[PDB]
Each structure stands twice: as structure tokens, then as C-alpha cells.
Design a protein around this nucleic acid. Structure first.
Ligand SMILES: [Mg+2]
Ligand SMILES: [Zn+2]
Ligand SMILES: [Zn+2]
Lengths: 114, 49, 392, 43, 147, 133, 263, 65, 30, 56, 181
RNA sequence: CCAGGA
């Protein structure tokens, strides 16, 4: 009865962008991206990759409440570097890493006879 | 599986709840409390079967 | 019921999905609520005046420090209390990754990454350090527990300077609904609105940390050492003889009654006293043999749940059973059960439960514990209405 | 259903307590909490 | 509730991915709080579980009968024969990160009961409604749309 | 901006009372007899046994937020093996010309007893602890 | 070859045992999550009941029909009805299944997932076939009928993900382990006397070097090398649970890059 | 009543395995633990599904209409 | 050996017979 | 006692309570259905007029 | 059970012998030796509370019969068969329990009231109440979709029809601190 | 009244 529809977890709302980038007030060159209809699956993945970027000073994500599929990701970079670009690169690195993972699995699978 | 032991009265299943009582025809002695003229009483709740 | 002004408090609405009224855990205590199937009432003011009354006089933050006992009536509980001890041990160090999430989780965080307590080899932060981010500036606290020095070797007591923990482990005495409390000081020093924020803050950090650290409790936590069990068995064994010795002494008419007591009254007092001395010894044996890794000990240590007796009764020995203060009496003519001989004043006959819950109870132990158990349920039942009318 | 067909009512010294004489005849655990506690026996 | 006076309502429902998991791929159906057990001293709940874990693996009926010669040690030995750690603990991994939990979780089957008290038959709200005739005050009970 | 204390001590005892990853160390200065030291160390990170000679340094520098890498090109003010950052919490006047200063490195406690460093140590959040050998 | 590497240990119709090295735990997990939740599958979603003389409820049966695995090989060429342009469903977005069963026999008449018949045009794509792994070739036992017990119904199967309902979950349990010797100190082993004696040694211990006590703690050490086992239900073949999982997560990340692009 | 399709905990189809299990017991005389394991039911979550099932449907069928 | 003392498991064979005959509502019926 | 010292009242609501680590101390999670029933009578004023017209 | 000093060979021994036990289990396989058969053969007797006053009962037969002429530590601490006077023996001590308490697994390992609580809650637990549910018109009926027999059971449940008509399901349960929910 | 829930 007070139960929300199951698609609300993944299907974007009426006039609701996937990303909402707001700037952090408390810190210089820091931003806050709210990811709608997303969970840990993506949050922790991105956060961990931004951690690999040397020019990235701060990176963390939080699912403020479990009833809602959305998470806030805070990115802080060195002066001159843009946090949107930092996010862009980490996103790219992830894809390229997954691309190799698929290629490598495919090759190895084809070798099996079962 | 239905065990019975109940009655059907105007549609509904009714249980006769067993009622606890003290047994009759029984001699019992009790000390009647500190403020009393009588100190002890022998009681018998006599009743026919 | 509503036997308190704190049993009716003003809250901010938060429309949410699902059919239940959700409440912050620390507000549980004033209401006296739990989530075993409790229901709660909601009343809506209809005037600007009425609303003001609620927001300005009876709002939850205002109600934190209560006049009932001139101390806080809400504190940190359960998961957050349990996790708070665990987080604040010297042993507890957090890697950069998690520190960043733990920091971001604090809704009022300055954006300042605190300098790690350990800078190389490998930057590492302590629990104490990252918890202190929830503690507001200006907050000063000092507490000395048994054996606290300015060097706090056992991580005893508490020392918070400028809303930064210097030493000691955070638990019930520090972060609970305690007189000297971190909460008592915060409400008083910073405000009710600031203190209410601190509850949320302390929990958002702690709960997050414990979500990833995890915490459990198993049968293994009731299990005590092989030799500790031999030592416990032989503690009951010697107390069992000490009792027979006073019994033989009483049967031989050598016993000398204490002024203002029956020869028998005097005897029962001794028996009951030895048997309890025993249950406790046996208990204190296990309590000591359980390592700091014991999940039960861990809950008892933080003050989150359970006490000494619970360990004792579970691990070592349940103990003597009472009804109307006295041991199990002779319901049957000169005996407690038909499985006993007449005029049996032995511990086993008059309701001494020798075994731990882990070991299991004998049918006799089981029934006597059942008699003793029923007594408490009767007063719980009665007291409820007697207590109610007194209030009225 | 089973436990309802084995229920005992006691209307009106210390009746609520579990007596020694209740051994093997009445359940030491199956009794209500509150008002009827120990006045509703189960065989 | 379990068969140990260990009652409660659902606080949240999590999907399989959010849930903590054994390396073996097993996930709980139910997460109950450690804080229940100590104050309550419901040891048989823990034993029920250990025995039920062995029972599930062994395919034999786990005898949880009262006065017997079954010991927590006896069952422990049998569980070690099955490859699990004797006291029922199992190492779990956090569902959100995949990182091992610093704690090992007491995990196994336990017989849980569904009770007659469900939130939707309880939930009730009113704001002006039927009134009594005599007193001209709000009628009684959820049933009657009372206040 | 500069160093505040320097001396080489010798560890008398190492204590992990219930603590699995931390140890209270007892040392005395090889140079000054008056000088002693009590200190909690992450022994899982930098292990310490008794009779080890250790260079113990203070220094108020090398403020605002903390930055992780770039330290490759940055001047690692550590010619030392284990470094900590903590706060000075008490100034004990232990008779005569003798003083004792208390340092908390986020719970990891330290007590330095001596005399001379009147013109050095201060009640500051800023105080690093450097250890080599 | 390049970045993260795979080394398959065992294969079948139902299982993939492998080793994932040169990867972030976060990545290993995110893939694990996706396989469970975000891979699309076909499953019965609407059940119109014409007749039911059974001992079971209309919805009791209905529920089961969703849990029956259907061929989702070519699931990728089927549209989500939500995205489709019709009114309710069509061929471009659904598979229509039919089930007519009757107790002709004096003996108990069984109703199986094999008794399902496709009535919609398949556009010649590998879809909607009730998955039969059964030795005797019956598949899932839906119902039991006696004599005049008739069951006549219609099923509309739709493309979906496990987030909406666990029926669209193509994977059973996913096994996941790392560091079988606790070299990383990621767990503090609960024990009574000895944690080594008390806790069972992992299978994967053989695929890693024991720590050798006479060595200091490697703090610098990080988590790479993950021993996993992916189990399929039928809808998609074991390999494709892994591949499609890798691909879904890749697509999921691309959406973010694209979102930034539109901004 | 009536074998669950899919194990609640992991969702391994268990709907097909019922008759096969009941057969490995009457016809093969085999003990419950081996039959379950033969049928490839390795995780206890899956084991409990079959091992603890009560097929009430069979009684339900005993009534005429 | 048909006159051998009874074991503890054998008490269940008697309990089986008690219930085979009396049933659970013996008292209500009788 | 029953009609005067105490009264049955409108703008009341009752349900099962459950805890939340993500609510702020002073707030209360209110089910959508309960919020959709309980009402506040707000006076149309220049300040709220537009907002109010929208909820209407 | 009746116990008699009456035994040519040795001590005071329980009238019922392993021969009667097989004589009963023969009749158990047939579905001629009933409960009435044990009652008329004077092996077993009916004792009310007033009569109980004058008897002397052994809990276990075997454990509480032949005297002493190492010991497991995990087992509970038990007393002895000191009595040579034994008139009767307990059929089974678990029989002191009623219908509801007889579904409690290991009630000898729980705190007294926790047991009293379960024998109140199980009355409110859902499951199949009767197999004829589909043919009866009752106000309210709650039936569990997929009931499961318990993995941990009582020997007493055999008679209670519990494994045939269960009140719950065996859930995979973790006792853990998770999201604090 | 009766049965139950915190
Ligand atoms: Mg409650
Ligand atoms: Zn379409
Ligand atoms: Zn499973």
C-alpha cells in the first residue's frame, strides 16, 4: 500500500536528469554530483577510480537513504583541473578496463571445451 | 486432521472451556487471621454427586 | 501510556513511502518504544498559534535534557553504541578511501581532511580522530575512570579538548543518557538544536563504519574454556559440600540461631547465601576466561546490551530459583516433587539450577525455573495497573 | 486449534503461581501475560 | 518471530546485491540484531540454528527435543565434518563494496513464523469524520473511521 | 617551521596489553640520564623490540587540509622510518628543572620526561613525531 | 594481453569457475552486483485466467509462472513494452504463451513448464522457450489436477531486470572470494584457541602462497585476484551472464559520460 | 504445498527436481542427503527447499470438486 | 531376551500407543 | 472522565512504528497515505497564494 | 510406568520390557497390542495429584535403575538413582509440556519466560490450519503459500501433526549489525 | 462481554 513502484529504482522520473552537478561551497575546486536512479553498483566503482587519479584530492559517495535510488558523489581536484573532467576520465578508464576484461574472458572461454 | 471435540451452533464452532473449581465433600482446616474471635475453622463444602 | 511530558513530543514531518511511522533511534527511550509491533499516535495542529506551541515548547531537541533527573533523557543506543566502542579503540585505524566516505557522511563537515595520526609508512587515521569530526568545537570534557592517569594506559575515562578526543574509549558513560555526558555538555554548551544535530552526526559516522566492519553474536560467544568448565564444575562441587556440612550440622542440633531468627530461618539464609556466592564465582570465572573478541563481552563492554549475570547464567551456571523470596517450597507433603525423598533440603531439591543455559536444564531444574519465572510474569502483569492508578 | 481444546479457566490463596502439584498435569510455560496470567491453565 | 519469544517487525527489505554474502554465494533471507540475544538469554535460538545448519547439509532431521544427550559440542563436530566453521560462523563480504567484513557472521537456517499482525491492517488516519449522536464527538475504531 | 627535539633512545620494554596492532614503548635517552619516554606505536606498521636504538624527533612543521600524492616530487621532510601527527595535551612540572609533556596522536599516547627543552616544546596541535632505525 | 585478466578453472551449461586478476575489488564487486541485478531476461508478467478448477489460487499459480525460466538468448532484439509504441503489448515487445490442461486420467495429471506453448510470432529469435534442464524433459512442475480439474490461461512474457523483480534474475548464487590466507588483514578471526586450526582452509589457498610467519605485515599490499563462480538459471548461457554483465556495467558507465556530454 | 520453483535465497530452479528427489528415495532407497546432493543441490539454502518441503497439494487433491 | 529392561528410546514407542488410542482431545470427547 | 477530560479527536493518525538511522533526531517518517489524509487549514495570503493554488 | 522390587533376577525393575516394546512396534507397522493392552497388563497406571503424594518417580528408566559397581563434560550435570523405593517411572519428562510448548526447540536452553512467550505467539503464526480450507466459509482465513517442516524438531511434534501442517518456513538467518535497520 | 496486541 504505501509501497513505491519497482521501476522507480531505475526509470528516471518526470523531468529528472541522471546527473545534477552542484558546486561545493565549503571547499575550492570541489563539486557535488547527484546521480538519480543509481546505487552502489556505480557509486563505489566511480569513487574507487577517481582515487586512482593523482590530480584528484577528494572523492567519496553516499546513499543518503535506502528508500531512494540516488547518490551524491563529491569530487575535489587540484587547481586548474576540472572535477567534471576528472569524473569524465575515471568513467573512461572504467570502460576501457571493462573492454579488456570482456575481450580476455571471451578469449579464455573459447579455449574451454565444456 | 480435524480432531473434533467442538460443537457447531448456528454455523459457528464452539469449544466448551474446562472450568476449574475446588472439589467438594472435602475437609479443610484454615487458621482465621490475627484480628478474629475464631482462631481456626474446619470447612466442608458438602454437595451431592 | 504517556506517563511523561516526553511521551508526547513535537517532530518535523518527513513524508516517506511504506506504511510505518519512522523514528530516529535515540528518541526511542523517552517514548519507551521498540519495533516488536508498537504503534504510535500522531496529532496535527490546525492553527499558526498551535504549531508555534509545538515547535517552541515541545520539540524533540528542547526535550533532550529533562527536569525529571536533571540529565539527558536521550542518548546513543544499540548499533551506534556498540559500534562507537569498536571504532574508538587504539587498535582501530582507517585507510584513506573509507576516511573520505566517513567524512562526506557528516552533513556539516568543513571540507577539511584532518591530518592522519600516522603519516608514513602509509597514511592512517584513528577512530577517535574521525569520530571527533562529529564533536563540535569548544566542547570540553574530562572523566577519570578507575585507574585513569593523564597517560590512560587502559584507554580509560575520557578527554575531549575543543571537540577533539584526546584519549579513552567512547561508550555508555560518554555518549549515553548520562549525567556528565557528551550530550549533557553539548545541549548545555552549544544549544538543543546543535545537540540534536550531533545525534544524527555521531550515528551517520558510526553506523556507516559498523556497516562495513560488521558485528555478530553466536553460540561460540556462550562457550567457555575446557579447563574453565572444570574449574566452574569444581566451584559448584565445593559449595555443594559446604551446604551438606551446614545441613549435617543442623540435623545434629549443633547450629546456633542468629538473634531474632528461627534455627531453620538461620539455616536457609546460609544455604541460599553459599549457593549465590557460588553462582557468582562460577560466573566471574567465565567472564574472565572470555577474550575481548567475545561478541557478548563486547556488547556488555560498550553498554549496548547485557550485563554480568547474563554471561554467568548463559556460560557457567543459572543459579538458585526463588518464589516469594524463599527457595522452591514443599508443595507436596515434605518434598518439592514426587521424584524426591521426603525432608530433602538439598540444593537440587529446593530449586538450585546447577547448569548453564548452554548445557541445558534437567526436568527438575526446568520446572523449578518455570515456577520462579512465572512469579515475575505475575508481578509484571499486576504492577501494570497498580502503577497506573498511582500515577493518576 | 489444538491448544484451544486443552484450555482451562479458573474464575476469581496464590492461584497465578505454578504449583508443584501442576507437574505433568498442566504446562509450566503456556499461560497468558497480563490479567489472566496463571488463571488460564493448559493441559 | 522465531520459536524463542524473539519477535519483531520488518524495518527494511534489501535486494540480493545489497545483502552481505558468504564466499560460497549464500545470502540471508533475514538479518536479526546481535543485541536481541544477551539480555534475553535465548540460547536455544543459537543452538536451533547450528543444528538446522547441520540438518540442512546432512539431510537428516535435526532433533531439537528437550531433555537429550545432544550437545553444542556434538553438533559443532558434525558441522566441521561439513566444511563449515564448527561454531556456525562464516566469513561474510559486504554487499555494497565486496570487502570482507572484519567480523564473521553467525549464519544458518532458523525456523521463522509469520504472525497475524500486518501493518496494512493496522495503519489508520482521520481528519474530520463520523461523529457519535449523543455526545456529538468522533466515533470509535479504525473500522468505523473513528478518531 | 623548524625542529623542536632530537635524541636517540634505547627501548627497555614493549607492551601490547590486549592491543593486537599497538604497543606502549618504554625508552630512555642514551645521551641524557634525566630523559625518559613512554609511547604508543603501530607495531603492525613499524615493529619495535627491546634494546633498539631509535632517533626520536619533534618539529612543528614538515595547517589547512591534507593532500595525498605529489609527494614524489614534494620534499618528504622524512629522513625517518615512521611519522605521526598529534596534539600536546598537558605540561607536567615534575619538580626541579624537570618537565614532562603529553602528546596524543589520535589516541596513541606519548609522555616525554626531561629538563632542557623549555625554549622548544609548546601546547600546539602542530607537533610531528619522527622515528628512525 | 592488456588490463584485467581472466583464467577459467571449470565450465558447464550451468557454471563458470574463474580467476580475475589485475582488478580493483570495487570493479569485481560492481560486476558481481550487475550479474545479479541488471542483466535483462524474458519472464511471464501478465496472466489472464480463463478457467481454474484447481486446488491452487489463480494468483498462486500466476506467481509461479513468472519464476519459470524462459529462453532469453535473443532478449536484446526484443523491446521493453514501456519503450515500445503499441497499446499494451505486441510482437516487437512480448512473447505470448498458452496453457491448457485437464485431468483426463483417473490418476493425478501433472502440469509442466513443457505444457506451455508459444502463440505469438517469434520473428525467428531465440526467445520464450521454457528452459528444460530436467532429465525426463518436463521442466518446472506448475500444477497437479485430479479429474474435472481444468486450467486454461494466457501468459504475456516481457523483457525486464532483477531490480523490478527477482524473476528476471538470470544468475543463481555468484561465489566470490579473495586472499584465502588473510594476508590483507581484512578480517579479525574469531577463535577459542587457534584461528588457523579453528577456521577451515579455502579451496583457493592452493592458488596463493602461504604467508610464512617470519615476515612483516605487507601494508602496501592491495586486493587483486578474485576467485569467482557464476551459476546460470537457464535464460542466458553461463558465459553470457559474465559477458552481458561486463557489457551492462560498461553501458551503465557510458550513460554517465553521455549525460555529462548533454550538460 | 506444491514444490517451490526456485530456491528463495539464491533462485536456483528447484521446480524440476521434486519428482526426481522423491524417486531417488523410493526406487533407489537412497538417504535424503545423498539424493539432494545427487540432484546437485549443494548450497544449504537450496537443500532446505526440498528437504523441508511439505507437498500438501496431494491431500488437497483428495477432495472431489 | 523379550524380558530385557527397556531403554530411553523405547518410551516413545509407549507414547506413540498413548496417542494412537486416546488422540489429542481424549478429555473433551470422553 | 471519558467525554470531557479525554475526547476522541480529528486530525489524529496511528500506525506501526519502525526505526531509521537516516532520519534526523527531531523528524518523523510519515507514510504518504497518512500525509494524504491529514490536513492543515492554511489561510490564502499574498505570501502563499501561488503555492496554495498549485496544491489545489 | 510401574516399577516393581519384583524381579527374580536382581533389583527393582520397570514392569515394561523390550519384548512389550517390540510387541507395540509390531502394531505400529500394521498401520493387536494397544495402550489398553499395557494398562490391563498392569505395566502402566493412571495417577492423579492426590495419589502422586504417596508415590516415588524415576525420571529416566535405564539411567535411574542399576547402581554403580571418563564422563562427558558437554552434557548437563545430572543427579542419581539412590532410591531403592521407586514405585513408578516417568514415561518421558518432556510430556510435562502442553501443545504449544512442545514445538519449542531446546526449551531446556531458554530463559523461563521466553518459552512462555513462544507458547502464545505460535497461536498467531500463519500456516495450513486444515486441508479442507478451500471448502469452508469462515470469517477470515490465513494460509501460508509454501509452508516448510522445521529443520530442528521435537519428538513430541510427531503426535502434534506439526510436520504435516506447519506454521512457518526455515529462513537463512544472519545475526548481524548491518545498516542499523 | 469474549478474544487479542505494546
Ligand atoms: Mg514493544
Ligand atoms: Zn509492443
Ligand atoms: Zn539456494
Amino acid at each position: 500500500m504505501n509501497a513505491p513502484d519497482r521501476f522507480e529504482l531505475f526509470l528516471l522520473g518526470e523531468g529528472e536528469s541522471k546527473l545534477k552537478i552542484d558546486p561545493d561551497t565549503k571547499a575550492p575546486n570541489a563539486v557535488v554530483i547527484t546521480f538519480e536512479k543509481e546505487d552502489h553498483t556505480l557509486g563505489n566503482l566511480i569513487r574507487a577510480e577517481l582515487l586512482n587519479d593523482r590530480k584528484v584530492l577528494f572523492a567519496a559517495y553516499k546513499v543518503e537513504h535506502p528508500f531512494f535510488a540516488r547518490f551524491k558523489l563529491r569530487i575535489q581536484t587540484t587547481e586548474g583541473y576540472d572535477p567534471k573532467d576528472a569524473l569524465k576520465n575515471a568513467c573512461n578508464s572504467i570502460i576501457n578496463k571493462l573492454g579488456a576484461l570482456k575481450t580476455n574472458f571471451e578469449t579464455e572461454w573459447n579455449l574451454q571445451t565444456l | 486432521f480435524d480432531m473434533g471435540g467442538y460443537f457447531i451452533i448456528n454455523g459457528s464452532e464452539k469449544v466448551l472451556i474446562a472450568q476449574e473449581r475446588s472439589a467438594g465433600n472435602i475437609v479443610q482446616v484454615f487458621k482465621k487471621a490475627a484480628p478474629s474471635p475464631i482462631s481456626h475453622v474446619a470447612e466442608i463444602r458438602s454437595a451431592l454427586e | 501510556p504517556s506517563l511523561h511530558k516526553m511521551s508526547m513530543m513535537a517532530h518535523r514531518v518527513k513524508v516517506i513511502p511504506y506504511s510505518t511511522f519512522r523514528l530516529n533511534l535515540s528518541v526511542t527511550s523517552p517514548y519507551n518504544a521498540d519495533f516488536d509491533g508498537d504503534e504510535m499516535n500522531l496529532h496535527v495542529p490546525q492553527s499558526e498559534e498551535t504549531r508555534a506551541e509545538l515547535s517552541q515548547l515541545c520539540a524533540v531537541p528542547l526535550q533532550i535534557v529533562s527536569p525529571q533527573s536533571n540529565k539527558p533523557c536521550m542518548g546513543i543506543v544499540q548499533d551506534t553504541l556498540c559500534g562507537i566502542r569498536k571504532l574508538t579503540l587504539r587498535d582501530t585505524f582507517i585507510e584513506l578511501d573509507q576516511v573520505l566516505n566517513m567524512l562526506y557522511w557528516v552533513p556539516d563537515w568543513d571540507g577539511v581532511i584532518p591530518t592522519p595520526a600516522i603519516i608514513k609508512p602509509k597514511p592512517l587515521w584513528s577512530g577517535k580522530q574521525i569520530l571527533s569530526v562529529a564533536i563540535p568545537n569548544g566542547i570540553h570534557l574530562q572523566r577519570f575512570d578507575e585507574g585513569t592517569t593523564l597517560l590512560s594506559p587502559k584507554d580509560n575515562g575520557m578527554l575531549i579538548i575543543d571537540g577533539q578526543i584526546i584519549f579513552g574509549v567512547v561508550e555508555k558513560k560518554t555518549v549515553g543518557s548520562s549525567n556528565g555526558g557528551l550530550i549533557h555538555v553539548v545541549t548545555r554548551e552549544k544549544g538543543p538544536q546543535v545537540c540534536a544535530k550531533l545525534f544524527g552526526n555521531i550515528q551517520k559516522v558510526v553506523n556507516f563504519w559498523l556497516l562495513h566492519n560488521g558485528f555478530s553474536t553466536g553460540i561460540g560467544d556462550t562457550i567457555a574454556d575446557g579447563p574453565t568448565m572444570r574449574e566452574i564444575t569444581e566451584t559448584i562441587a565445593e559449595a555443594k559440600k559446604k551446604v551438606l556440612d551446614v545441613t549435617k550440622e543442623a540435623q545434629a542440633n549443633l547450629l546456633t540461631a542468629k538473634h531474632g531468627m528461627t534455627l531453620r530461618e538461620s539455616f536457609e539464609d546460609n544455604v541460599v547465601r553459599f549457593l549465590n556466592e557460588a553462582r557468582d564465582k562460577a560466573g566471574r570465572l567465565a567472564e574472565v576466561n572470555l577474550k575481548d573478541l567475545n561478541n557478548v563481552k563486547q556488547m556488555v563492554m560498550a553498554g549496548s546490551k547485557g550485563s554480568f549475570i547474563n554471561i554467568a547464567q548463559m556460560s557457567a551456571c543459572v543459579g538458585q530459583q526463588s518464589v516469594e523470596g524463599k527457595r522452591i517450597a514443599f508443595g507436596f507433603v515434605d518434598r518439592t516433587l514426587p521424584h524426591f525423598s521426603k525432608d530433602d533440603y538439598s540444593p537440587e531439591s529446593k530449586g538450585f539450577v546447577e547448569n548453564s543455559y548452554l548445557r541445558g536444564l534437567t526436568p527438575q531444574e526446568f520446572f523449578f525455573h518455570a515456577m520462579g519465572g512465572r512469579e515475575g510474569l505475575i508481578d509484571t502483569a499486576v504492577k501494570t495497573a497498580e502503577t497506573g492508578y498511582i500515577q493518576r | 486449534t489444538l491448544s484451544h481444546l486443552r484450555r482451562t479457566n479458573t474464575p476469581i490463596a496464590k492461584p497465578r503461581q505454578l504449583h508443584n502439584t501442576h507437574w505433568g498435569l498442566v504446562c509450566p510455560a503456556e499461560t497468558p501475560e497480563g490479567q489472566a496470567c496463571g488463571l488460564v491453565k493448559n493441559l | 518471530a522465531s520459536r524463542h519469544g524473539q519477535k519483531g517487525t520488518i524495518g527494511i527489505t534489501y535486494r540480493r546485491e545489497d545483502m552481505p554474502f558468504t564466499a560460497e554465494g549464500i545470502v540471508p533471507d533475514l538479518i536479526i540484531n546481535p543485541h536481541a540475544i544477551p539480555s534475553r538469554m535465548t540460547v536455544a535460538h543459537l543452538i536451533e540454528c547450528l543444528l538446522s545448519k547441520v540438518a540442512a547439509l546432512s539431510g537428516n532431521e535435526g532433533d531439537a527435543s528437550p531433555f537429550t544427550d545432544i550437545t553444542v559440542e556434538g553438533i559443532s563436530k558434525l558441522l566441521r565434518e561439513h566444511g563449515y566453521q564448527s561454531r556456525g560462523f562464516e566469513v561474510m563480504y559486504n554487499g555494497h563494496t565486496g570487502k570482507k567484513l572484519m567480523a564473521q557472521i553467525f549464519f544458518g537456517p532458523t525456523y521463522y513464523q509469520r504472525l497475524r499482525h500486518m501493518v496494512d491492517d493496522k495503519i489508520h488516519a482521520r481528519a474530520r469524520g463520523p461523529m457519535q449522536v449523543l455526545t456529538r464527538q468522533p466515533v470509535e475504531g479504525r473500522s468505523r473511521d473513528g478518531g | 617551521s623548524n625542529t623542536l627535539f632530537d635524541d636517540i633512545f634505547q627501548v627497555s620494554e614493549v607492551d601490547p596489553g590486549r592491543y593486537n596492532k599497538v604497543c606502549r614503548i618504554e625508552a630512555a635517552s642514551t645521551t641524557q640520564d634525566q630523559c625518559k619516554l613512554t609511547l604508543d606505536i603501530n607495531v603492525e606498521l613499524f615493529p619495535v623490540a627491546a634494546q633498539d636504538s631509535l632517533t626520536v624527533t619533534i618539529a612543528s612543521s614538515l595547517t589547512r587540509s591534507w593532500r595525498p600524492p605529489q609527494a614524489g616530487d614534494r620534499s618528504l621532510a622524512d629522513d625517518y622510518d615512521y611519522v605521526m601527527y598529534g596534539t600536546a595535551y598537558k605540561f607536567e612540572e615534575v619538580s626541579k628543572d624537570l618537565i614532562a609533556v603529553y602528546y596524543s596522536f589520535g589516541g596513541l599516547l606519548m609522555r616525554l620526561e626531561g629538563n632542557y627543552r623549555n625554549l622548544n616544546n609548546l601546547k600546539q596541535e602542530n607537533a610531528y613525531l619522527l622515528i628512525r632505525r | 594481453e592488456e588490463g584485467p585478466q581472466v583464467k577459467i578453472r571449470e565450465a558447464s551449461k550451468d557454471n563458470v569457475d574463474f580467476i580475475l586478476s589485475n582488478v580493483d575489488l570495487a570493479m569485481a564487486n560492481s560486476l558481481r552486483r550487475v550479474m545479479i541485478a541488471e542483466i535483462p531476461t524474458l519472464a511471464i508478467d501478465s496472466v489472464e485466467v480463463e478457467t481454474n478448477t484447481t486446488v491452487l489460487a489463480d494468483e498462486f499459480i500466476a506467481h509461479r509462472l513468472g519464476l519459470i525460466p524462459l529462453q532469453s538468448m535473443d532478449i536484446e532484439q526484443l523491446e521493453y513494452s514501456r519503450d515500445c509504441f503499441c497499446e499494451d503489448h505486441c510482437d516487437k515487445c512480448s512473447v505470448v504463451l498458452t496453457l491448457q490442461a485437464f485431468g483426463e486420467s483417473e490418476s493425478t495429471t501433472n502440469v509442466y513448464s513443457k505444457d506451455l506453448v508459444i502463440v505469438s510470432n517469434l520473428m525467428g529469435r531465440n526467445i520464450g522457450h521454457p528452459i528444460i534442464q530436467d532429465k525426463e524433459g518436463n521442466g518446472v512442475l506448475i500444477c497437479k489436477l485430479r479429474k474435472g480439474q481444468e486450467l486454461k490461461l494466457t501468459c504475456v512474457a516481457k523483457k525486464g531486470i532483477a531490480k523490478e523483480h527477482a524473476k528476471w534474475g538470470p544468475a543463481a548464487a555468484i561465489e566470490f572470494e579473495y586472499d584465502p590466507w588473510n594476508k590483507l588483514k581484512h578480517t579479525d578471526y574469531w577463535y577459542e584457541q587457534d584461528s588457523a586450526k579453528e577456521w577451515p582452509q579455502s579451496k583457493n589457498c592452493e592458488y596463493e602462497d602461504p604467508p610464512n610467519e617470519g615476515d612483516p605485515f605487507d601494508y602496501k599490499a592491495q586486493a587483486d585476484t578474485f576467485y569467482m563462480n557464476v551459476e546460470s538459471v537457464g535464460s542466458i548461457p553461463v558465459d553470457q551472464v559474465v559477458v552481458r554483465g561486463i557489457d551492462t556495467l560498461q553501458k551503465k558507465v557510458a550513460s554517465i559520460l553521455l549525460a555529462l556530454t548533454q550538460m | 504445498m506444491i514444490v517451490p520453483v526456485r530456491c528463495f535465497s539464491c533462485g536456483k530452479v528447484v521446480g524440476d527436481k521434486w519428482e526426481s528427489y522423491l524417486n531417488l528415495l523410493q526406487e533407489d532407497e537412497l538417504d535424503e542427503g545423498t539424493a539432494l546432493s545427487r540432484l546437485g543441490l549443494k548450497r544449504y539454502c537450496c537443500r532446505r527447499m526440498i528437504l523441508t518441503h511439505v507437498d500438501l497439494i496431494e491431500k488437497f487433491l483428495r477432495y472431489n470438486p | 531376551d523379550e524380558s530385557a529392561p527397556i531403554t530411553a528410546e523405547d518410551s516413545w514407542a509407549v507414547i506413540s500407543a498413548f496417542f494412537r488410542e486416546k488422540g489429542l482431545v481424549s478429555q473433551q470427547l470422553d | 472522565r471519558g467525554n470531557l477530560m479525554g475526547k476522541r479527536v480529528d486530525f489524529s493518525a496511528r500506525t506501526v512504528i519502525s526505526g531509521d538511522p537516516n532520519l534526523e533526531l527531531d523528524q518523523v517518517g510519515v507514510p504518504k497515505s497518512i500525509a494524504k489524509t491529514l490536513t492543515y487549514p492554511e489561510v490564502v495570503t499574498p505570501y502563499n497564494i501561488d503555492r496554495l493554488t498549485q496544491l489545489v | 510406568f510401574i516399577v516393581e522390587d519384583d524381579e527374580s533376577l536382581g533389583h527393582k525393575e520397570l514392569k515394561v520390557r523390550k519384548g512389550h516394546i517390540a510387541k507395540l512396534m509390531a502394531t505400529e507397522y500394521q498401520d493387536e497390542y494397544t495402550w489398553s493392552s499395557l494398562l490391563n497388563e498392569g505395566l502402566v497406571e493412571y495417577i492423579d495429584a492426590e495419589e502422586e503424594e504417596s508415590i516415588l518417580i524415576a525420571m529416566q528408566p535405564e539411567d535411574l535403575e542399576p547402581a554403580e559397581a571418563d564422563v562427558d563434560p558437554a552434557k548437563r550435570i545430572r543427579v542419581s538413582h539412590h532410591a531403592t523405593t521407586f514405585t513408578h517411572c516417568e514415561i518421558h519428562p518432556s510430556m510435562i509440556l502442553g501443545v504449544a510448548a512442545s514445538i519449542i526447540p531446546f526449551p531446556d536452553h531458554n530463559q523461563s519466560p521466553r518459552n512462555t512467550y513462544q507458547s502464545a505467539m505460535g497461536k498467531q503464526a500463519m500456516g495450513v490450519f486444515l486441508t479442507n480450507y478451500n471448502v469452508r466459509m469462515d470469517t477470515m482465513a490465513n494460509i501460508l503459500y509454501y509452508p516448510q517442516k522445521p529443520l530442528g524438531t521435537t519428538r513430541a511434534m510427531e503426535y502434534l501433526k506439526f510436520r504435516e501442517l506447519p506454521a512457518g518456513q526455515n529462513a537463512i538467518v544472519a545475526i548481524a549489525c548491518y545498516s542499523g535497520y
